Design a binder for this molecule. Structure first.
Ligand code: CLA
Ligand code: CLA
Ligand code: CLA
Ligand code: CLA
Ligand code: CLA
Ligand code: CLA
Ligand code: CLA
Ligand code: CLA
Ligand SMILES: CC1=C(/C=C/C(C)=C/C=C/C(C)=C/C=C/C=C(C)/C=C/C=C(C)/C=C/C2=C(C)CCCC2(C)C)C(C)(C)CCC1
Ligand SMILES: CC1=C(/C=C/C(C)=C/C=C/C(C)=C\C=C\C=C(C)\C=C\C=C(C)\C=C\C2=C(C)CCCC2(C)C)C(C)(C)CCC1
Ligand SMILES: CC1=C(C/C=C(\C)CCC[C@H](C)CCC[C@H](C)CCCC(C)C)C(=O)c2ccccc2C1=O
Lengths: 75, 729, 139, 37, 141, 80, 75, 39, 31
């Protein structure tokens, strides 16, 4: 289930989610990383588990501050 | 069945476990059918010579590869910017990016940048061209062949050493203090003053040159008469360039104290004078123990005379305990080797004695971490052989009421106090780290508990650091120990007060908490190991553990169920702790020196006091250049360390399978695979000779321990090398 | 010491103007900013703690230290003597599983005489058992 | 992939030897040894 | 003793039964005398119909035969306590294994011999230093 | 094969014999306890080393010990 | 998993033309792509009283509500 | 209720009442006097 | 200034005899 929800989160925030623009173009959250960088274990580590964990890392002194001390708590 | 030859009980079972158990009991010579007492020692002696030849072949291979494929002649021209080369790359799987990225340090072939300290070593020794160290490689091949021939001839019955020769402790302790530790350090001080220091003065001294020129122009006669100050007449000044003759006054034994200002290393004359002053004391202390000549000491009368009221019977009947057994000697040897190996590690980063090795930061990091990971191994093995000594070679009727038996009589006090010390350090070091991490998470980092480590700063104050203002005994200039007129006052004081080197680093409030963490890991690893050694004989669960042996799986599910009851399984848990605390101190060392080398000391001084600072500014920040060793766009020279990073993660998680899952599941699975092979039609032709079973309990424990260990070591040797070679290279 | 006090540190005076309000009192950061002024700070602006044993900084370490050394000893004595007075009633197992809560409340209130009672039990010999009548493990 | 050093022809045959020819005959000799009687 | 008299019970066939060790090294065979045509669970897998009278069942290990003997002696109201477990070699010889003395091992009879009985406690065992290179065991000698 | 050694602390409670699912233990007559019988292990080549006899024994540090020695086809419990 | 190790090694050895990417040796999942084609062609042929599809994850227009993307087709 | 007094005096309910009283006086002391790194 | 091919072949030949001597040591350590 960890790999299933990882595939869900990365595919939906690379190919589905993101903001929209009035001319019809769609820019995603991770700018389409799942195409050529989801096929590597280093791609799953660098572009998903290192790049997207920065929002848990750098969120101190803010509203998302309990998630950092739940991140380290789960470890 | 011929394999194994030594064991008869493993040469008869038809299972596949006899291959594994024949592999792992090949060196335990005590459990060999048909081996007497003296054949044990003679096989040990021949195997000693085999290992001492393997280590010479390994040193000869390092020498031969620096000679052949290394840019050693191009490294001495500019050793501050160019990179050393270990060897070349010849795997046929390289594409075009992996060839265009691995042609580093100016070489058309794909090479591999050396991160061990062999180049700075061979430059400080005085080797300049590749031809002389290639000749050293050929010399070490001949020397390894010499020790191989010694190992062969000491198995013939004519040259077979008797048991009383191996029991002759006093007639080899003298030669190991004088003829091995003294005269070899004497020969090394001789090589220093003859070849190493004149090559640091520019004079090329070879084997056809040292017989003619003297190292000092005064000759040998000022040593024979006296007034040795002419050997320290004119030292090398601060304006000296290494390898040339520029401000280099010829004097072979100059005690200065402090660092060479050009190479950030110790003075080579100081190194030579130190080795002479240790060779003299070692040859003096080698004439202590009694031999054929009646003058000397016999260790029985020394040990039997050290009694006491509180001590008990003292060390009486204890020479026979050490001299008859072998695991006691191996435990003492591994303990002393482990403490001096960590001494090597702590004195090769703060007192570097190699040319331009304080600037090559990745080399210093790799050498320190390698020697600490050797020292943790040797400490665990010292205690493991202590437990083997308590299982096999301990008799309570001869060691009656002495310090060993009185050690065993209060083992429930020892390991309970170690349990107390471990819980005392652990509850509050984790308590302060979680307290700091919560109050930084709540945006209030002023509520952190930052205890000033005043004891260590006091040690720096009596060492020479006048930074903290504690005017005690060396920083106060009017002290008793300062105004002695000794040679090491002004150079060591200016070296310890220079905030550029890595000698006596500025200890901040984070180092208090991390040094308590290393005291925690040391006390808990000592807890598991001493509990394994003292309960190796027995306890309230099974007091016949001397009868079962050292390593055995369990004693069934009865009496509560004694999984991990052997002393081998206390080694098993202590191996994880040794890897854990070595990871703690090497994370701490590498982050401190990354703050020192980059000049950003404030990052380590602000962020290390809470756990997310370690998780962000060390594990997340420094590993950014590692995982980008291969992108979908391109491949740089850090790709092999990114592949080694993922490799180390895979082996570290493969050990989890053997650790968590146990044997009975895998035996039920192997029954089905055996059925499928015996009922597949075209595979009924091929049948096994040995019946395939699952791995045994203690066996697959050891396999999961091996994967945990080498997985840990490979992923950390990937990260520790590539992060500081991406930052400084 | 090489550490500047918080009354004149520039980084601490720059950081004290925006201390965050912890409790519901809106002036809690300001009163914390003047409470932590007596302490000493390093080059980062956070209050360090001198722990050497000098009494001029005993409020950093020693004044809570003996305070905990009361309360832990209180808990230890309440946990110890209660076990002694359930060494026999009829059966100690149920009296350890369910609590004889008036006896526990009696010990919990009376535990504040613990250090004089500790020296009294150490002198009477009913604190430390003998080294031979203790159920040790076989060697 | 080439060799700028002396005797570049030598790893061209020593890498497949120690990679294939040495471990195949080592495992062949060891499997013949450990399964014989 | 040397000849196995019995009929095979009604069973459809399983996969955990006799593997290639039976016709090569050894196998086992349990023979018992039933009362009715009841149902028993064999340790190979699944259920089987126990035939009326003396019936014979071939198994691969002795532990499966003793597990079936436990199932015959406890899980039936007509308690079958007259079963014989033989060991059959591929050469054809049949070795009477259990209850070969004639009476069950749970009760005592005259005619047995104390094999593997020590005359000391476990705390009176010798130490492995005095026999460090004799090749024996600390429990044997 | 393993070695099942039975010491003189046995009280003849015959729990170990009815617990072992391989018929190696058996009660022989004796004169050193109240039950006047002691367990004995003649068929030690059939013992797998399961130590199920060292779960049902009432003495302190149970009077029957199973020393795990050599292995074979019977002692490893293989049906193949 | 050995597919993941194989193109991890082909990316680490600097040869991206030997990977299992889309520009490399491509393992196109043809069955679910054909099923997505049937779900896109469903309203009007095999579900005539249905206006839109079962979802916009199979195939169709990009649904944008408040500057963000609700559901676009997942190739 | 001769059994309710025994159930309210079991080990989990008494240790939860004691930890509730301890956490209560700790939170109250930290509300009326917050942010005390030292004395 | 670098090495020559004959020095590499001489290094192989002078290391051939440690292979024979380690083979002798391994044979007499087995027996
Ligand atoms: C992060 C994981 C972790 C942690 C915290 C511990 C912690 C501990 N191990 Mg340990 N250990 C671990 C992994 C870990 N181990 C692993 C992977 C192995 C390898 C198998 C071992 C093997 C090992 C051995 C072999 C031994 C220990 C022992 C100990 C204890 C003493 C050492 C110490 O530092 O004092 C105390 C440190 C602490 C951090 C304790 C605090 C724990 C929490 C925070 C207490 C707070 C209460 C908690 C919140 C209540 C939960 C409430 C919840 C139900 C809602 C300590 C409890 C030794 C022992 O127990 O004897 C003394 C011992 O002999 N360990
Ligand atoms: C499919 C992937 C793959 C494969 C097969 C290889 C294969 C190889 N690489 Mg390689 N490499 C790879 C991917 C791969 N690489 C990647 C992705 C990178 C990152 C870009 C690299 C980077 C790299 C570098 C930088 C170097 C190599 C080198 C080598 C060669 C090792 C030389 C040798 O045979 O020593 C023998 C092999 C060993 C000693 C290792 C085996 C250790 C065993 C398992 C442990 C001992 C077992 C037992 C106790 C004793 C053996 C028993 C037996 C005798 C029966 C070998 C041909 C080196 C080279 O060219 O050679 C000089 C080299 O320098 N590789
Ligand atoms: C002068 C006479 C002499 C000499 C030189 C030796 C030498 C030796 N004996 Mg020996 N022996 C002697 C007399 C002598 N023996 C006598 C008279 C007896 C009579 C009973 C014995 C009985 C004896 C036995 C029974 C055994 C030996 C063994 C050994 C070897 C082990 C030492 C070793 O490998 O590490 C040498 C280590 C050092 C020289 C340095 C120690 C580490 C230092 C302290 C660390 C710090 C400095 C470090 C060097 C810095 C490194 C820097 C780096 C750049 C290199 C060694 C070759 C053992 C053996 O066979 O092993 C092969 C063995 O089992 N000897
Ligand atoms: C001076 C060093 C030294 C010496 C001479 C010995 C000697 C001995 N030890 Mg020992 N030991 C040491 C250090 C040493 N130890 C240390 C440092 C530790 C702690 C780690 C131990 C832990 C230890 C244990 C736990 C045991 C011994 C035992 C023994 C005895 C038998 C060894 C045997 O048969 O192993 C056979 C050899 C092996 C099993 C080889 C395993 C090691 C492999 C190479 C590790 C795999 C690494 C992997 C291939 C790397 C991959 C890299 C890459 C390919 C990815 C023997 C007297 C045993 C004993 O006396 O009781 C039976 C025993 O149980 N030792
Ligand atoms: C109140 C009873 C009591 C008392 C007087 C002690 C006393 C002691 N314990 Mg201890 N202990 C207790 C309960 C108690 N323990 C319990 C319940 C546990 C299980 C969690 C432990 C687990 C434990 C370990 C693992 C160790 C000690 C050790 C020690 C000794 C060193 C001091 C120490 O570290 O304690 C600190 C105490 C703890 C870390 C755990 C106790 C924490 C609880 C919350 C205390 C209160 C328990 C209870 C609820 C109060 C009863 C009140 C009553 C009215 C109902 C000391 C003699 C150490 C030793 O051997 O020293 C040589 C050691 O290693 N204890
Ligand atoms: C132990 C030290 C050591 C080590 C780790 C290596 C490692 C290596 N050598 Mg090498 N070498 C060594 C000593 C060593 N060498 C010595 C002493 C010589 C002089 C004869 C050479 C001569 C040599 C040549 C000429 C070449 C290599 C090459 C290589 C690389 C590919 C492997 C290969 O083909 O080797 C095969 C090596 C040989 C056939 C001869 C050396 C054999 C040594 C003497 C045996 C070492 C004993 C060892 C400790 C036993 C371990 C036992 C353990 C498993 C229990 C690899 C990096 C090749 C290379 O650079 O490719 C890029 C290459 O062309 N080596
Ligand atoms: C450590 C040594 C080593 C070495 C040198 C190699 C070398 C090679 N591997 Mg390889 N590999 C290794 C370890 C090694 N591997 C390991 C450990 C693994 C497991 C992870 C793999 C898995 C692997 C895969 C999965 C693949 C390779 C492939 C290749 C080849 C790439 C080019 C090619 O297609 O060759 C063409 C093939 C050859 C050169 C085969 C050798 C045939 C020779 C020329 C015939 C000589 C025989 C002759 C008659 C006998 C002479 C007698 C003698 C005494 C003189 C290359 C030769 C690729 C390949 O296609 O290889 C087939 C490939 O797909 N390797
Ligand atoms: C070794 C353990 C240890 C120690 C000595 C302290 C000590 C302290 N903590 Mg603390 N704390 C700890 C662990 C510890 N904590 C842990 C593990 C957590 C996480 C649950 C916290 C979470 C915490 C908070 C959230 C707060 C304290 C605060 C305090 C301080 C005042 C406490 C009070 O009520 O007055 C005091 C210095 C308070 C403070 O303001 O500190 C100055 C405060 O608000 N602590
Ligand atoms: C179990 C066992 C064992 C083991 C053990 C061990 C392993 C131990 C270890 C131990 C150790 C590991 C120890 C160490 C320690 C040391 C020390 C503790 C030292 C100290 C020193 C000093 C104190 C000095 C001083 C000084 C200083 C500090 C500084 C300045 C200078 C001077 C010099 C003054 C054995 C083998 C016996 C066997 C039996 C059993
Ligand atoms: C002041 C100070 C310090 C110091 C300290 C020290 C140095 C310590 C030591 C310590 C020690 C040296 C200790 C000893 C001890 C011993 C013993 C012997 C103990 C006793 C105990 C007991 C006996 C217990 C009992 C009890 C109680 C009391 C209560 C509760 C219950 C019980 C039972 C637990 C420092 C620097 C840190 C800092 C500053 C301050
Ligand atoms: C997987 C697993 C098995 C099954 C292991 C098996 C079937 C062994 C299969 C090993 C295969 C053949 C790989 C071995 C090859 C390795 C590369 C090692 C090389 C061989 C050495 C001699 C060098 C167990 O038996 C087991 C037992 C107890 C706890 C955990 C486990 C466990 O996790």
């Amino acid at each position: 289930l960890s790999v299933v929800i990882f595939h869900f989160s990365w595919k939906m925030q690379s190919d589905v989610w993101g903001t929209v623009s009035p001319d019809g173009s769609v820019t995603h959250v991770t700018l389409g990383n799942f195409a050529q960088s989801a096929i590597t274990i280093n791609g799953w580590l660098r572009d998903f588990l290192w790049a997207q964990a920065a929002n848990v890392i750098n969120s101190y002194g803010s509203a998302l501050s309990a998630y950092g001390i739940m991140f380290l708590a789960g470890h | 069945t011929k394999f194994p030859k030594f064991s008869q009980d493993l040469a008869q079972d038809p299972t596949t476990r006899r291959i594994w158990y024949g592999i792992a009991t090949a060196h335990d010579f005590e459990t060999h059918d048909g081996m007497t007492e003296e054949n044990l020692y003679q096989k040990i002696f021949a195997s000693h010579f085999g290992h001492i030849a393997i280590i010479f072949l390994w040193t000869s291979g390092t020498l031969f590869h620096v000679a052949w494929q290394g840019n050693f002649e191009q490294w001495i021209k500019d050793p501050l910017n160019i990179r050393p080369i270990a060897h070349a790359i010849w795997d046929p799987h390289f594409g075009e990016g992996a060839v265009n990225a691995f042609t580093q340090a100016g070489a058309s072939n794909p090479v591999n940048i050396a991160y061990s300290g062999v180049y700075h070593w061979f430059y400080t020794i005085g080797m300049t061209t590749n031809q002389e160290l290639y000749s050293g490689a050929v010399f070490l091949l001949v020397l390894a062949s010499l020790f191989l021939f010694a190992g062969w001839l000491h198995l013939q019955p004519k040259f077979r050493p008797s048991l009383a020769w191996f029991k002759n402790a006093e007639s080899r302790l003298n030669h190991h203090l004088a003829g091995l530790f003294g005269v070899s350090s004497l020969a090394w001080a001789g090589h220093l003053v003859h070849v190493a220091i004149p090559e640091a003065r520019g004079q090329h001294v070879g084997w056809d040159n040292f017989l003619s020129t003297p190292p000092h122009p005064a000759g040998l006669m000022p040593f024979f008469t006296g007034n040795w100050g002419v050997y320290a007449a004119d030292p090398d000044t601060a304006g000296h360039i290494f390898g040339t003759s520029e401000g280099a006054g010829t004097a072979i034994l100059t005690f200065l104290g402090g660092f060479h200002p050009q190479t950030e290393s110790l003075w080579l004359t100081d190194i030579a004078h130190h080795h002479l002053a240790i060779a003299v004391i070692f040859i003096i202390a080698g004439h202590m123990y009694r031999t054929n000549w009646g003058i000397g000491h016999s260790i029985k009368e020394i040990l039997n005379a050290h009694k006491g009221p509180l001590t008990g019977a003292g060390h009486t009947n204890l020479y026979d305990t050490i001299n008859n057994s072998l695991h006691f000697q191996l435990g003492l040897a591994l303990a002393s080797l482990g403490v001096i190996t960590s001494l090597v590690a702590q004195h090769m980063y703060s007192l570097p004695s190699y040319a331009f090795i304080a600037q090559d930061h990745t080399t210093q990091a790799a050498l320190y971490t390698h020697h600490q990971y050797i020292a943790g191994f040797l400490m665990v093995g010292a205690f493991a052989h202590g437990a083997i000594f308590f299982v096999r070679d301990y008799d309570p009727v001869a060691n009656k009421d002495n310090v060993l038996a009185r050690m065993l009589e209060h083992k429930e006090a020892l390991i309970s106090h170690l349990s107390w010390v471990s819980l005392f350090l652990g509850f509050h070091t984790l308590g302060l780290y979680v307290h700091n991490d919560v109050v930084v998470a709540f945006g209030t980092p002023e509520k952190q508990i930052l205890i000033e480590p005043v004891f260590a700063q006091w040690i720096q104050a009596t060492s020479g650091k006048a930074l903290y203002g504690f005017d005690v005994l060396l920083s106060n200039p009017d002290s008793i120990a300062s105004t002695t007129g000794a040679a090491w006052l002004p150079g060591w004081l200016d070296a310890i007060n220079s905030g550029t080197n890595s000698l006596f680093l500025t200890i901040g409030p984070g180092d208090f908490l991390v040094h308590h963490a290393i005291a925690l890991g040391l006390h808990t690893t000592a807890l598991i190991l001493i509990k394994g050694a003292l309960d190796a004989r027995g306890s309230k669960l099974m007091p016949d553990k001397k009868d079962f042996g050292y390593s055995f799986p369990c004693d069934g599910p009865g009496r509560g169920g004694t999984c991990d009851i052997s002393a081998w399984d206390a080694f098993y848990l202590a191996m994880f702790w040794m890897l854990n605390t070595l990871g703690w101190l090497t994370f701490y060392w590498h982050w401190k020196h990354l703050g020192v080398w980059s000049g950003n000391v404030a990052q380590f001084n602000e962020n290390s006091t809470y756990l997310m600072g370690w998780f962000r500014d060390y594990l997340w920040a420094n590993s950014a250049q590692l995982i980008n060793g291969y992108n979908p766009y391109g491949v740089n020279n850090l790709s092999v360390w990114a592949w080694m990073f993922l490799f180390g993660h895979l082996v570290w998680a493969t050990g989890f399978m053997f650790l968590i899952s146990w044997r009975g599941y895998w035996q039920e699975l192997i029954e089905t695979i055996v059925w499928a092979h015996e009922r597949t039609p075209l595979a009924n032709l091929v049948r096994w000779k040995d019946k395939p079973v699952a791995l045994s309990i203690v066996q697959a424990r050891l396999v999961g321990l091996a994967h945990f260990t080498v997985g840990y070591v490979l992923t950390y040797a990937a990260f520790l090398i590539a992060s500081t070679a991406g930052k400084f290279g | 010491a090489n550490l500047t006090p918080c009354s004149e540190n520039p980084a601490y005076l720059a950081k004290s103007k925006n201390f965050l309000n912890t409790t519901n009192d809106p002036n809690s950061g300001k009163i914390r900013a003047e409470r932590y002024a007596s302490a000493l700070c390093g080059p980062e602006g956070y209050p360090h703690l001198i722990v050497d044993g000098r009494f001029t900084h005993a409020g950093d370490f020693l004044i809570p230290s003996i305070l905990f050394l009361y309360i832990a000893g209180w808990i230890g004595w309440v946990g110890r003597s209660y076990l002694i007075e359930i060494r026999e009633s009829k059966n100690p197992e149920m009296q350890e599983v369910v609590i004889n809560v008036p006896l526990a409340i009696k010990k919990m209130l009376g535990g504040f005489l613990w250090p004089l009672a500790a020296v009294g039990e150490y002198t009477s010999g009913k604190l430390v058992m003998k080294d031979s009548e203790i159920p040790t493990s076989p060697r | 992939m080439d060799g700028s050093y002396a005797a570049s022809y030598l790893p061209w045959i020593l890498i497949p030897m120690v990679g294939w020819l040495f471990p195949a005959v080592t495992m062949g000799l060891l499997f013949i040894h450990i399964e014989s009687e | 003793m040397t000849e196995l008299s019995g009929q095979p019970p009604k069973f459809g066939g399983s996969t955990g039964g006799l593997l290639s060790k039976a016709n090569r090294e050894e196998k086992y065979a349990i023979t018992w005398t039933s009362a009715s045509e009841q149902v028993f669970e064999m340790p190979t897998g699944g259920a089987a119909i126990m035939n009326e009278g003396e019936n014979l069942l071939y198994l691969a290990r002795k532990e499966q035969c003793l597990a079936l003997g436990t199932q015959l002696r406890t899980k039936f109201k007509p308690k079958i306590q007259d079963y014989k477990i033989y060991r059959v070699y591929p050469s054809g010889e049949v070795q009477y294994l259990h209850p070969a003395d004639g009476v069950f091992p749970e009760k005592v009879n005259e005619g047995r011999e104390a094999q593997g009985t020590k005359t000391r406690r476990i705390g009176q065992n010798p130490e492995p230093v005095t026999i460090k290179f004799s090749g024996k065991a600390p429990y044997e000698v | 094969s393993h070695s099942v050694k039975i010491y003189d602390t046995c009280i003849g409670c015959t729990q170990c014999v009815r617990a072992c699912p391989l018929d190696v233990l058996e009660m022989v007559p004796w004169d050193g306890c109240k039950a006047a019988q002691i367990a004995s292990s003649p068929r030690t080549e059939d013992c797998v080393g399961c130590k199920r006899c060292e779960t049902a024994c009432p003495t302190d540090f149970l009077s029957i010990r199973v020393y795990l020695g050599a292995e074979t086809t019977r002692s490893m419990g293989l049906a193949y | 998993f050995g597919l993941y190790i194989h193109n991890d090694t082909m990316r680490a050895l600097g040869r991206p033309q030997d990977m299992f990417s889309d520009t490399a040796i491509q393992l196109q999942p043809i069955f679910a792509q054909w099923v997505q084609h049937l779900h896109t062609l469903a309203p009007g042929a095999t579900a005539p009283n249905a206006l839109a599809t079962a979802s916009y994850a199979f195939g169709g227009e990009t649904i944008a509500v408040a500057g963000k993307v609700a559901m676009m087709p997942i190739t | 209720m001769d059994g309710l007094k025994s159930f309210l005096s079991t080990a989990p309910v008494m240790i939860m009442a004691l930890l509730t009283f301890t956490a209560g006086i700790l939170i109250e002391f930290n509300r009326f006097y917050p942010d005390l790194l030292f004395h | 200034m670098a090495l020559s091919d004959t020095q590499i072949l001489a290094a192989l030949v002078v290391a051939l005899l440690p292979a024979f001597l380690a083979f002798r040591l391994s044979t007499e350590l087995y027996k």
